[PDB]
Amino acid sequence: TRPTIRPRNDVVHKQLSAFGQYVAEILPKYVQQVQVSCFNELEIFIHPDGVIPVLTFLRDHTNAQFKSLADLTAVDVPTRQNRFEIVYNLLSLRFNSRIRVKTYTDELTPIESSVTVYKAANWYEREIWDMFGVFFANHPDLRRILTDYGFEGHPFRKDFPLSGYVELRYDDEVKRVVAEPVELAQEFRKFDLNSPWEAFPAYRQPPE
Amino acid sequence: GTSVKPIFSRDMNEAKRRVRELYRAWYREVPNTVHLFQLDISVKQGRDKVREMFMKNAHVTDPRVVDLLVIKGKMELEETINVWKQRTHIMRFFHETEAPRPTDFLSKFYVGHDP
Amino acid sequence: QLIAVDEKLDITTLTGVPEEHIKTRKVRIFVPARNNMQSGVNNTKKWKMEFDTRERWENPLMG
Amino acid sequence: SRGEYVVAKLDDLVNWARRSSLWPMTFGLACCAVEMMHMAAPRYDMDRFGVVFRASPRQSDVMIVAGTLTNKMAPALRKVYDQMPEPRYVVSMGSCANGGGYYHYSYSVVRGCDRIVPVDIYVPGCPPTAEALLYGILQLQRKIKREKRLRIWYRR
Amino acid sequence: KVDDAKVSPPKRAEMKTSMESLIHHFKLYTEGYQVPPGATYTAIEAPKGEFGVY
Amino acid sequence: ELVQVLRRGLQQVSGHGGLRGYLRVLFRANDVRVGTLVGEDKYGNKYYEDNKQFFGRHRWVIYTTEMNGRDTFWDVDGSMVPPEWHRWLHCMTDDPPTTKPPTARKYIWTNHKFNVSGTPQQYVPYSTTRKKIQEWVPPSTPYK
Amino acid sequence: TYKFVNMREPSMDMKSVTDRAAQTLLWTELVRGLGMTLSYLFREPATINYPFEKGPLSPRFRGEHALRRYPSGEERCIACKLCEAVCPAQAITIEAEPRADGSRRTTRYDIDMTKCIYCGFCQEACPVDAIVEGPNFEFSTETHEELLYNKEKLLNNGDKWEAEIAANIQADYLYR
Amino acid sequence: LHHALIPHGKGGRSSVSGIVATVFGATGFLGRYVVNHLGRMGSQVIVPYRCEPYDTMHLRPMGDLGQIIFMEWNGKDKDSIRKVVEHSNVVINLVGREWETKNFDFEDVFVKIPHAIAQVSKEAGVEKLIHISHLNADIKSPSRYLRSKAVGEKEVRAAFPEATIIKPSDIFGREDRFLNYFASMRWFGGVPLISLGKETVKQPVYIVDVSKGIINAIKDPDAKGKTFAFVGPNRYLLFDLVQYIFAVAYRPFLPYPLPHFAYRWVGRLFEVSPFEPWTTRDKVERVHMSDMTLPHLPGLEDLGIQATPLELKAIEVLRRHRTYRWLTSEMEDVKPAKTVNI
Amino acid sequence: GVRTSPTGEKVTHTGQAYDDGDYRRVRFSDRQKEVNENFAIDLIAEQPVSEVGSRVISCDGGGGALGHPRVYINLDKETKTGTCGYCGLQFRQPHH
Numbered sequence A: 001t002r003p004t005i006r007p008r009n010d011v012v013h014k015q016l017s018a019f020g021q022y023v024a025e026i027l028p029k030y031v032q033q034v035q036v037s038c039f040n041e042l043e044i045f046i047h048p049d050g051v052i053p054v055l056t057f058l059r060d061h062t063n064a065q066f067k068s069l070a071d072l073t074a075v076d077v078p079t080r081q082n083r084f085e086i087v088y089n090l091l092s093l094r095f096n097s098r099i100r101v102k103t104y105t106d107e108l109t110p111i112e113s114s115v116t117v118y119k120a121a122n123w124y125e126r127e128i129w130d131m132f133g134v135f136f137a138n139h140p141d142l143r144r145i146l147t148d149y150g151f152e153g154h155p156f157r158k159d160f161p162l163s164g165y166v167e168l169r170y171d172d173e174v175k176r177v178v179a180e181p182v183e184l185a186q187e188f189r190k191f192d193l194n195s196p197w198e199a200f201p202a203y204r205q206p207p208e
Numbered sequence B: 001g002t003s004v005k006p007i008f009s010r011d012m013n014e015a016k017r018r019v020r021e022l023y024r025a026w027y028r029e030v031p032n033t034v035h036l037f038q039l040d041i042s043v044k045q046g047r048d049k050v051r052e053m054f055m056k057n058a059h060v061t062d063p064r065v066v067d068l069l070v071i072k073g074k075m076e077l078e079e080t081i082n083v084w085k086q087r088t089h090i091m092r093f094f095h096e097t098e099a100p101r102p103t104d105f106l107s108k109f110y111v112g113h114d115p
Numbered sequence C: 001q002l003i004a005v006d007e008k009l010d011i012t013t014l015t016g017v018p019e020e021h022i023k024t025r026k027v028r029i030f031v032p033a034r035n036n037m038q039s040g041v042n043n044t045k046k047w048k049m050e051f052d053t054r055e056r057w058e059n060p061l062m063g
Numbered sequence D: 001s002r003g004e005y006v007v008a009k010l011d012d013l014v015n016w017a018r019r020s021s022l023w024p025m026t027f028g029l030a031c032c033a034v035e036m037m038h039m040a041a042p043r044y045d046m047d048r049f050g051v052v053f054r055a056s057p058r059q060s061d062v063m064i065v066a067g068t069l070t071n072k073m074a075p076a077l078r079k080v081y082d083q084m085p086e087p088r089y090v091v092s093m094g095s096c097a098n099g100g101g102y103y104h105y106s107y108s109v110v111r112g113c114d115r116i117v118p119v120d121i122y123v124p125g126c127p128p129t130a131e132a133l134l135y136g137i138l139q140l141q142r143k144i145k146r147e148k149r150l151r152i153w154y155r156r
Numbered sequence E: 001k002v003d004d005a006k007v008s009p010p011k012r013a014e015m016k017t018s019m020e021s022l023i024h025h026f027k028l029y030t031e032g033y034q035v036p037p038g039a040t041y042t043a044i045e046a047p048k049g050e051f052g053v054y
Numbered sequence F: 001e002l003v004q005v006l007r008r009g010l011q012q013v014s015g016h017g018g019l020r021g022y023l024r025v026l027f028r029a030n031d032v033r034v035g036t037l038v039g040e041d042k043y044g045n046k047y048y049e050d051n052k053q054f055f056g057r058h059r060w061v062i063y064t065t066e067m068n069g070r071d072t073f074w075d076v077d078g079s080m081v082p083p084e085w086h087r088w089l090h091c092m093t094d095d096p097p098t099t100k101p102p103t104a105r106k107y108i109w110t111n112h113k114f115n116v117s118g119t120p121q122q123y124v125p126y127s128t129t130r131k132k133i134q135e136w137v138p139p140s141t142p143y144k
Numbered sequence G: 001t002y003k004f005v006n007m008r009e010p011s012m013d014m015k016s017v018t019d020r021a022a023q024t025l026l027w028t029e030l031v032r033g034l035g036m037t038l039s040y041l042f043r044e045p046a047t048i049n050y051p052f053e054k055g056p057l058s059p060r061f062r063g064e065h066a067l068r069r070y071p072s073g074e075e076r077c078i079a080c081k082l083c084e085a086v087c088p089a090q091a092i093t094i095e096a097e098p099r100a101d102g103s104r105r106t107t108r109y110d111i112d113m114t115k116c117i118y119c120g121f122c123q124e125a126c127p128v129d130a131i132v133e134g135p136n137f138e139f140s141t142e143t144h145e146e147l148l149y150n151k152e153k154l155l156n157n158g159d160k161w162e163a164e165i166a167a168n169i170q171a172d173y174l175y176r
Numbered sequence H: 001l002h003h004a005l006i007p008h009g010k011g012g013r014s015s016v017s018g019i020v021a022t023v024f025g026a027t028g029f030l031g032r033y034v035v036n037h038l039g040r041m042g043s044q045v046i047v048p049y050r051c052e053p054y055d056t057m058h059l060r061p062m063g064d065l066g067q068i069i070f071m072e073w074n075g076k077d078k079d080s081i082r083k084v085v086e087h088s089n090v091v092i093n094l095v096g097r098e099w100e101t102k103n104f105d106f107e108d109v110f111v112k113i114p115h116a117i118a119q120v121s122k123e124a125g126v127e128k129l130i131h132i133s134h135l136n137a138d139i140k141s142p143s144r145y146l147r148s149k150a151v152g153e154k155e156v157r158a159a160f161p162e163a164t165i166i167k168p169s170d171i172f173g174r175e176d177r178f179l180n181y182f183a184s185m186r187w188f189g190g191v192p193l194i195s196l197g198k199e200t201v202k203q204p205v206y207i208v209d210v211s212k213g214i215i216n217a218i219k220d221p222d223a224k225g226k227t228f229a230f231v232g233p234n235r236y237l238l239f240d241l242v243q244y245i246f247a248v249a250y251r252p253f254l255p256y257p258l259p260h261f262a263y264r265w266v267g268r269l270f271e272v273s274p275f276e277p278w279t280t281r282d283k284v285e286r287v288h289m290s291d292m293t294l295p296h297l298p299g300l301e302d303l304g305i306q307a308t309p310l311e312l313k314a315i316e317v318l319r320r321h322r323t324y325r326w327l328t329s330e331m332e333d334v335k336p337a338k339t340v341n342i
Numbered sequence I: 001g002v003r004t005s006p007t008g009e010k011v012t013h014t015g016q017a018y019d020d021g022d023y024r025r026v027r028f029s030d031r032q033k034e035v036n037e038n039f040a041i042d043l044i045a046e047q048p049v050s051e052v053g054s055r056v057i058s059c060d061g062g063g064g065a066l067g068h069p070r071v072y073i074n075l076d077k078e079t080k081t082g083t084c085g086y087c088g089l090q091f092r093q094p095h096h
């Protein structure tokens, strides 16, 4: 090991495992999985119905006190039946700790809005709806945040093209900015970078 | 059963009701949009365009998809009413600058390789 | 309580994709062939979806 | 000819007046504007050349596009360009404004501000240094010095 | 930089002298280094507040 | 110490070659300081230094009045500085190209050119590759 | 370990009360601000006399791109295309073929200067020191097309700036 | 077809149309629309300009990189014309002035310059030539402007037999001198009309219609040696047309009759301006001249264009001429004028 | 080693010149065509062939670490000289 290798922390790993067991015991109705990564990060995979209870428990419970919502985002995996992975990152100042809560949904199933638990979620949820098209029920004001007015589609979906479908230019005949189908003078050049040799034997999958 | 959670409507009838309310709102709004944005089109053109945008999705049979379409249309209406959109955003519905692309086989064959 | 929809999934009206790029596209689903220049087989594990090749032309100013 | 001499001298006078007093709009978009802020800083002191920022488009002469132009922002840039009274000039500063730069292949970025407005000077860099921007403004001054509006009118 | 040529590029003198250094320079500047699968949230106290990457 | 600064002003007047030189430098460079001459270009630019000035004002160039083809009595720009004095002037080195001349190569430009944008000498991009697809040439004789 | 920034109590004796009243009525801190500005007025300004005086740079400065040659005049580039692969903005376009003498050389080497982010990754990736970012930074144009550099423009840049480029590389190459 | 000149792409900004067009007089009213329509589809456009380069800047965003090239030219110099038409397969002529200066009269701009352009294009190998004339061009016309148009079109047809001649009638648009002229006539209180404008008939045509007609004539193979007349779908009396113009701009309409000689004297008085005259004797002549009917010529419908009625496009020209109180009034509010359609 | 095409256009070191009927020549009107005059093939053909007394020579382009990766060239064939694949310098064993 020595100099070039990142060191381990067994104390934090044990503490996070114990707290994950604690949370899983307290909420068997919604918790589906608990994980602790090799770099000491605790993840809790829950059922979509438990978004409001679990988060509430992690905010108001005396032993958790995860009072800060550091980040809320989505991850798109097209190969899954439930396309979108909703990820919450929470920080507890009282116990100087961080936790991750992960749930799932598809294009047509709404997720409960968390603005009653964390106000900071508001814009975050908007961004998810803007960037992936996931609808959040009971959002006080849900609408586009990052994209242009009238923009069609959700650009952070993996099947959305990198350059989109339309581009803008000023047209002098109508004396205004117009949108037209995209044409690129130089097409973006796709690179095939993956090596045909396996890099990490520890992550090898069964041959099916 | 397929065990699917609704968004707003249980079946297609309440979805059609919501569609009708959204259509009423857009139809009422069109003259105000024409006046405020100072558009060269008439109210008839705007209402015909609203009808065309509504009929673009007339084949949908899933109440959840209809609910999401109504949500998006309400978002667009709220954008239009508050003058968050500009004249260019409204006029993008009419494609006044794009040349008319032919539909018959012969013209596509003459022009290029696209099907 | 659930509503029990009974129709096959269709999200074409929600993705904002233009019409031409739905009904005129043909996607190929395949496991990519091994690159014959190498013996490694790590790139022949997953399935890929790709679209049909359309026209590319030379740019007049730069080529 | 006396008339040709008179119009040439008047062209000289008006060109000197217009290039010695260049007022760019207070207008920046991204990291490039920071370097623009370093061109007004004491080391370079753009005000010593007669270059003064003015917030109102009606009271400004130059548009410096310092930063990426998105599709959501293009109508506003075109609007505040149109509201500049003439004669007006546009300086494109940085790779993003010149041709898109690092975000050229994005879905939400205009690939160069010259698709929206005519451009007089292109200042390369990511970002261009404050000295490079000063060189760009001095080159624009020279280009304005090369103008012959009244001579063209007289020869019509 | 870390003395691990599978992650950090070698010095230019070694790249022009040793076969392994040239191979690793080539591969690090064409393909890059593979990162083991996983997700992290890493935050710092940036001058404007907590700045993070998931 | 007022008389001292007045005498320094008169010395600056006298060190520029008379009143005409003082006016020429005032209206050409907006500066009338006097420094030790470091060297001259083959194009006519004179390079001066003054180590008592703070970092940034301790090196400067009085540009020539006549570069490759244009009159530069008023139209001067930083692109007229040749690369060797460019390295000296921007403080990337502490040695003038006089005491430390650059390395001579047969392919190096023997004549520096400034920025030529806006002139008939400007660079025009073009594709430098050959034609890719060759068309079939029909025979020039009749077929019946 | 922390400190407080705004947790001090003013003393309530008659002397302090009179001092604060005189401060309110006679504007002493405003006079202090005026004095600070007046002090700055008589300081020497930090302005340089551009373009006659130039800002300081470094041998590591990344400016206009150039293509270099060997001392014999042969091109250093061998069309390995590492710079094209590493370019974060895809600003480099390269085509190559065997030369009439069988050498490995480029037939097209274009850099889109309006796509470039001027990061210097290309000159790091180059194994023969063929492509460099030169010291020049004053190359503003009047048209967009003039900033689309082909191989001839880059070779001319190299031939024009080689004297300074070689010196900068000689000063820097022991850190690389 | 010279492989480099083979159409490619989807027909947009980055495509290749196969058209290399030299557009004389591209810095005017019709020229900007023609250049925009050429640059939309990816054509190579050459702009000869005599004005100050600042006056060409609005043409720059009209094309992709390298697709619009500006070169200086001189009308009285044939070498300039040859230089600007060397590598083109299409030449369009839009050079024209509605008044006479001390260096160029109507003969210079409508006869000599078109003849030089046509002859130089013919000897340079240009395949297609488009020349613009007037619908009311007449050798016996009272106005000098139409006599010069007739002579110039005869000379151009002599020099370039395969040329396409297009004869529009009083184009109206945002930068026109037709609707803006009558709208600006409000500054004098009353509107002076010869015979109250009751024996004059107009058939104005939309600017976009004329530009698309020119583009289609370039792309039409049968339109090589033909002559076209570009007119609008409706015919109006001058009185009703001016009344409708003032009604759309919401200005008080006070028409009064002015005798022909007095109006000619007024035009001659306004001709003395060293700048662009507000009106001329020739302008007074042409305003009160009835638009000819030429049913033997092909029109916009023969080039696939449906003529746009004025009642649909007049608001985009005359909303600028309204006061603040009437700026937001809609297009369908002003009751289209009566039309004498045969 | 520049050469002028029959149209007056300089032929670049890549051999590219517009055809007499190519419209793109119009881009050079009122302007110039950028051509580099130092053709590398002629310059590398100008160098003499170095005589060395070993079967294998080493070349790094000169300048130490400032050149190209160091390579080894075999010199067993007398029919042809050994050419460096990077810099183009030629080497040979003494003959005749």
Ligand SMILES: CCCCCCCCCCCCCCCCC[C@@H](O)O[C@H](CO[C@H](O)CCCCCCCCCCCCCCC)COP(=O)(O)OCC[N+](C)(C)C
Residues within 6 Å of the ligand: D009, D010, D012, D013, D016, F027, F028, F029, F030, F074, F075, F076
């Ligand atoms: C009386 C009220 C009515 C009139 C109101 C206006 C009054 C007249 C304006 C005063 C004129 C003075 C301006 C002249 C300054 C020129 C200075 C010099 O720099 O110009 C040079 C050459 O001069 C210009 O080419 C022409 C300017 C001279 C104008 C011609 C004289 C015409 C006077 C006619 C007055 C009539 C007024 C209207 C009467 C009805 C070009 O140098 P430049 O590139 O910049 O500087 C480079 C920067 N460096 C030096 C640091 C390197």
Ligand SMILES: NC(=O)C1=CN([C@@H]2O[C@H](COP(=O)(O)OP(=O)(O)OC[C@H]3O[C@@H](n4cnc5c(N)ncnc54)[C@H](OP(=O)(O)O)[C@@H]3O)[C@@H](O)[C@H]2O)C=CC1
Residues within 6 Å of the ligand: H024, H025, H026, H027, H028, H029, H030, H031, H049, H050, H051, H075, H094, H095, H096, H097, H098, H104, H109, H132, H133, H134, H135, H168, H169, H170, H171, H172, H177, H178
């Ligand atoms: N306007 C109308 O209602 C219709 C006009 N058409 C015809 O169509 C043609 C163009 O129309 P339009 O654009 O409206 O007219 P404009 O006056 O608006 O533009 C004329 C163009 O021709 C150029 N030009 C004029 N005179 C000269 C000259 N002596 N030398 C060089 N160039 C010159 C102008 O360049 P610059 O800017 O430098 O002066 C300008 O680019 C004209 O011939 C006109 O007669 C005929 C029917 C009516």
Ligand SMILES: CCCCCCCCCCC1=C(C)C(=O)C(OC)=C(OC)C1=O
Residues within 6 Å of the ligand: D026, D027, D028, D029, D030, D031, D032, D033, D034, D036, D037, D040, D053
């Ligand atoms: C007068 C002192 C110098 C002011 C220079 C004004 C520059 C205007 C650019 C607008 C702008 C401002 C104000 C600004 O503060 C900022 O930082 C967030 C920007 O992003 C870089 C900007 O673009």
Ligand code: SF4
Residues within 6 Å of the ligand: D030, D031, D032, D033, D066, D067, D068, D093, D094, D095, D096, D097, D101, D102, D125, D126, D127, D128
């Ligand atoms: S060019 Fe570079 S520095 Fe300038 S705004 Fe764009 S990304 Fe920022």
Ligand code: SF4
Residues within 6 Å of the ligand: G083, G086, G087, G088, G089, G090, G091, G092, G111, G115, G116, G117, G118, G119, G120, G121, G122, G123
């Ligand atoms: S500096 Fe960076 S962006 Fe520019 S060409 Fe080199 S690698 Fe590409």
Ligand code: SF4
Residues within 6 Å of the ligand: G076, G077, G078, G079, G080, G081, G082, G083, G084, G094, G125, G126, G127, G128, G129, G130, G131
């Ligand atoms: S410049 Fe260097 S890295 Fe790029 S292709 Fe040439 S030799 Fe390879």
Ligand SMILES: [Zn+2]
Residues within 6 Å of the ligand: I059, I060, I061, I068, I084, I085, I086, I087, I088, I089
């Ligand atoms: Zn070698």
